[PDB]
Subunit: 316 residues, 2 copies
Amino acid sequence: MEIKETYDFSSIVDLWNKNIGTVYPMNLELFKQNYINDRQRKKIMGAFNGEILIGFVIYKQWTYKSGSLKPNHKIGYINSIIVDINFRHQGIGTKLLDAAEEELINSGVKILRCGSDTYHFFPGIPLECLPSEEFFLVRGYKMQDYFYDLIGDVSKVDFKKPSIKDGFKVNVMKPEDRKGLFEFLEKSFSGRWLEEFIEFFQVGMKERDIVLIKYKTSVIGFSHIYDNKSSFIGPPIYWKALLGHNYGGLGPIGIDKTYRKQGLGRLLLYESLQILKKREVKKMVINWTEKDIINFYGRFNFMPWKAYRKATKEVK
Amino acid sequence: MEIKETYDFSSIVDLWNKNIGTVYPMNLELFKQNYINDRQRKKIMGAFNGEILIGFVIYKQWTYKSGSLKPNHKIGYINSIIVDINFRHQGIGTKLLDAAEEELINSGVKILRCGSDTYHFFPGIPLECLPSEEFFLVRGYKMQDYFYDLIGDVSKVDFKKPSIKDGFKVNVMKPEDRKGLFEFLEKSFSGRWLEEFIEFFQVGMKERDIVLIKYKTSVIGFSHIYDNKSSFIGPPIYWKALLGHNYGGLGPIGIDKTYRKQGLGRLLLYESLQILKKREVKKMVINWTEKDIINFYGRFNFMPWKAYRKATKEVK
Ligand SMILES: CC(=O)SCCNC(=O)CCNC(=O)[C@H](O)C(C)(C)COP(=O)(O)OP(=O)(O)OC[C@H]1O[C@@H](n2cnc3c(N)ncnc32)[C@H](O)[C@@H]1OP(=O)(O)O
Ligand SMILES: CC(=O)SCCNC(=O)CCNC(=O)[C@H](O)C(C)(C)COP(=O)(O)OP(=O)(O)OC[C@H]1O[C@@H](n2cnc3c(N)ncnc32)[C@H](O)[C@@H]1OP(=O)(O)O
Ligand SMILES: CC(=O)N[C@@H]1[C@@H](O)[C@H](O)[C@@H](CO)O[C@H]1O
Ligand SMILES: CC(=O)N[C@@H]1[C@@H](O)[C@H](O)[C@@H](CO)O[C@H]1O
Ligand SMILES: C[N+](C)(C)C
Ligand SMILES: [Cl-]
């Protein structure tokens, strides 16, 4: 058994799908997309039986700016770790994680997160990977709160228009909106979501996938939507093989803090869903939500679908 | 808005699917099988807008024997409750549950359970209905531990036979095993599982659905397996619309108490899966497991798929 760096994506993807493909169906396009485009200091360590890949760990350190935030080198990420089912309980997982953790720690990492990285596969430890919690617990990870992906079939329900509101308009983004959007993000969501917008446009996100809410002239909120014609396979549609032919998704979605708790998020959501529904979307996901916002999406018939536990190791 | 008893199973099935069908796809066949064959005192109370069903609750009292056990009339069950998405937060669920609970309480129920009834749809509050936990909390239900359905694609993996002490042999049940099977259940599982066996054989279960493990001529264990030829749609295959073609399932599985913790359950599980694999089964479910037993199945590449929270109200 040898531990060494690998960039054999096909072998990794095949191993992924054999072990967890029932609930996290991976394809090479997504896998390449997310690994190649990530801008953080990153590495894949494989475990090998001769030339046969029998495990891997993908890990990162926050070394690349997030919008207006400079990188915090103290934060590292385990993007994913899987040892093949036929080679479990032989110490392979331990060695892979030790290899990742040692390297991150030697480069100044003091806080180690299970998922939640840029270009993540997971926001935390998936519930379908619940048995892994004990493996991480024993290795110093503290198990925290949950995040959720929500699912709904927008073809199945009609919603009545939200209360009409003077001044506000919701519309898919046009090219001309680009400057107003970027100024809005700089003001209101100037970290990760600003960074995503910067980078997603560079790898073929299109304006048709952004919805904007304006008061008069000013962008006060946005949503990012996905359907089966979107070319960027973003987080809401990672697991689109589970979502049927007319799959879609939504996230992120945000309203300027000033404007919140007055029904404008609701208006944005409603019209964003109406847009997807007119694009003939059926089953669709709203990814990476907190418990106390579930009911906001629940109003529109969304239900928790996948749950992920937040898990963090502090290097003492 | 009227609260009254409802008979139209098709309207119930549609409301079910409209509201939660993405994650718990119902059909009339499944609905009828489970509601009609249930032997407890049972009722469906509907909430109506004129002629239109807008919500329902299905509820039961333990009034029918369970193998050699008398019913405990102190136990009641909320089988399911759904209010249509366009009629939430109008007090309808409250009204429906108030009626169900009042009727149960009046016929002697002191402990009200979420799910877990005979012919259940759910062992507890599904994670996909996490928001309803709060609804049940306010009514005095205590949120307790979790159960899990596990999923695996038995076509994707091969395992080495577990080592086999001489004398033990596993085989698919034959008609002449019936008496030996019933003697064994009477000895080791004389409550719920004996009762399921009694009833299921009356409503379409075939011997080909049962695997037996013997020590010599003695039955010492069984599993109930399911594929797309099973005429009884049991708990593992309720949500078969999510499992694809060549779906299957397994559960229950039991070994005589005097024979446990010697590797025999592992052997029975292994052969049961081999039989399903040879039947061309792909994705399959092992239903209603506790957290402590997940790794037993985990070694055969099963993963938690659905989670349900146990919830119990003590009548004051
Ligand atoms: C951010 C995320 O990736 S979340 C998702 C995590 N990944 C998954 O859930 C995918 C599915 N699961 C897996 O791939 C694996 O179970 C992993 C990666 C979690 C664990 O990998 P493994 O190779 O089994 O780990 P390893 O074998 O080192 O350790 C497991 C146990 O076996 C023990 N062990 C080590 N050598 C042996 C041996 N020769 N014989 C028996 N047991 C052994 C270890 O001590 C350990 O027990 P401990 O945790 O109580 O210390
Ligand atoms: C065993 C099982 O069945 S588990 C699965 C449970 N079912 C589901 O999850 C299906 C999806 N969800 C639903 O169907 C619904 O949300 C239900 C059944 C959980 C609740 O139905 P509702 O009709 O919205 O309940 P109802 O309106 O009485 O009460 C809900 C909330 O609205 C408010 N409310 C209560 N009464 C009223 C009223 N007269 N008018 C307006 N609002 C009210 C309260 O804020 C209440 O919150 P609380 O329950 O936390 O106190
Ligand atoms: C509902 C929502 O907005 N979820 C977003 C998600 O879409 C995005 O992928 C992630 C990372 O930026 O941040 C979450 O907050
Ligand atoms: C793994 C297992 O045995 N699960 C069984 C399940 O199959 C069965 O449906 C239920 C009710 O009888 O009892 C559970 O213990
Ligand atoms: C690097 N990150 C903070 C955006 C996850
Ligand atoms: Cl009835």
